[PDB]
Write a protein that binds this ligand. Structure first.
Ligand SMILES: C=C(C)CCOP(=O)(O)OP(=O)(O)O
Ligand SMILES: C=C(C)CCOP(=O)(O)OP(=O)(O)O
Ligand SMILES: C=C(C)CCOP(=O)(O)OP(=O)(O)O
Ligand SMILES: [Mg+2]
Ligand SMILES: [Mg+2]
Ligand SMILES: [Mg+2]
Ligand SMILES: [Mg+2]
Ligand SMILES: [Mg+2]
Lengths: 274, 288
């Protein structure tokens, strides 16, 4: 009903504006990175799986979605730093450290990480649900998730590596937090164990597809699919990953009260053509 | 020994899961193992014990989470764009031992991992959610990171006592208040008791930064494990810079006195044995 993008941004603004401000500059810097566009694929997938499962959307679903986006946004800020990829622009816009300075951007990223779990604990979900969501969000973001993947992507700089090493980087650097929204929606829906596993499986496939798509675009728009396998095979892997994800979603819809059309449409907009 | 077990708990979190990056685990564990007084996690645990609750592995995990955020804050605080120290805890800072990128990510890990650690306890789930909300509140934009920004923005500025307190209560106060509040929450105490423990923690937390400011300009490298007098070169707003050393020593001493008096008063209102906590506060006292 209400535009999900607008509501997600309003949820985020409300978190920063509802409490007595301590540092105006910190709030400003954090919101700069939030308001600097973003397709919001991660929170949108969470919300769309919730609706697909016939659950009416509430304030709390938007907060859980927002928590996820805050972690994603924080990782981008740090990834751009001079000590990291040292980029002056993300999406044709000044990166945080260039808009402000290096110390501000390090702290803005730290805030988004730490704040996200506060956003997530503000929901009205049953408390056992919230605890699992926190555990899994940490697992997907930290030393055994996104941060680990970031370290391996650095550790990788040194070498040609095989498929196994490329998949290891992607799985953790990006795969985990693209899969989280699928698993998390299913957990909020209180689905049984094997359904949770299926939803996580979809998410990992979509995470893979998203990273292969990235690699293909970044050379039509080092340690990548096109470099490792060539373009032809990269296109093939993207296409069969999306097919595979779509087939599992359709099979669920033939088995439980699940209406994934909007998800299937979102996935269809990721496709690339020769 | 609590020190030993806190470290054991952090080690197990990192070693008992399948490693993704050996260099990340190495960088994180480097800063942990370089040292630290563990005042925060120890305070949490001593409150629990003072309230007559036998310690369990779950209390140590909650304590560890708190130390993990603390350690993350130090790694970032030491960075060249922040306070730029080559030394922390007697050893090379993370960014000098490895590199700046590694230090950034190691700090990030610690922050994100800490909530995972906290979520692994066997506490009732409403308790855990309360601790998560309050730990985030103490640590983030409205706590420690908020105070870190104020501290950087105040360099070279002539600020008043109110502004200085704001910096200190947020960058340092929040995460020393948290362990008192948190232990009382775990203990399931009533509202006015939670507030009393929070107040003891805010008193101790502000005093701790007064103490740190003092040490910065009076202690030697071997004593503080970090490069002396950075506050002077950087023109930080500090208690000695605003009020002078003499009044700063006075404030520290009387703040510690107040915290102890409230703790002693609690012991004739509920079942509470504060001796180890009082002992710990006594080790914080400074002489001019
Ligand atoms: C976890 C994150 C932030 C992914 C960063 O990966 P890259 O560094 O390869 O991606 P872009 O900067 O091109 O987004
Ligand atoms: C002053 C602050 C808040 C940072 C250092 O805290 P500690 O003095 O507790 O440092 P470690 O013992 O943990 O090294
Ligand atoms: C969150 C932190 C680090 C508060 C203490 O600030 P300082 O910068 O004075 O701490 P030290 O580096 O002197 O330990
Ligand atoms: Mg990168
Ligand atoms: Mg990058
Ligand atoms: Mg500092
Ligand atoms: Mg410092
Ligand atoms: Mg200091």
């Amino acid at each position: 009903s209400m535009d999900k993008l607008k509501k997600i941004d309003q949820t985020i603004h409300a978190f920063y504006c509802e409490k007595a401000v301590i540092s105006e500059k910190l709030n400003e810097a954090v919101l700069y990175s939030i308001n600097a566009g973003g397709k919001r694929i991660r929170p949108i997938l969470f919300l769309e799986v919730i609706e697909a499962l016939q659950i009416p959307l509430t304030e709390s679903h938007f907060k859980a979605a927002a928590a996820l986006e805050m972690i994603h946004t924080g990782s981008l800020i740090h990834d751009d730093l001079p000590a990291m990829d040292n980029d002056d622009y993300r999406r044709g816009q000044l990166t945080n450290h260039k808009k402000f300075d290096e110390a501000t951007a390090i702290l803005a990223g730290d805030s988004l990480f730490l704040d996200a779990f506060g956003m997530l604990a503000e929901t009205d979900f049953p408390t056992d649900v919230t605890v699992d969501l926190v555990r899994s969000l940490s697992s997907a973001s930290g030393t055994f998730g996104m941060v680990g993947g970031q370290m391996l992507d650095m550790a990788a700089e040194g070498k040609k590596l095989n498929l196994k090493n490329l998949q290891l980087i992607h799985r953790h650097k990006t795969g985990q937090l693209l899969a989280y929204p699928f698993w998390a929606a299913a957990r909020v829906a209180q689905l049984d164990e094997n359904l949770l596993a299926t939803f996580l499986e979809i998410g990992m496939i979509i995470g893979l597809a998203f990273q292969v798509r990235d690699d293909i675009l970044d050379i039509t728009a080092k340690m990548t699919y096109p470099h490792l396998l060539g373009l032809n095979e990269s296109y093939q892997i993207l296409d069969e990953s999306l097919d595979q994800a779509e087939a599992i979603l359709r099979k669920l819809s033939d088995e439980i009260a699940f209406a994934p059309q909007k998800i299937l449409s979102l996935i269809e907009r990721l496709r690339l053509d020769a």
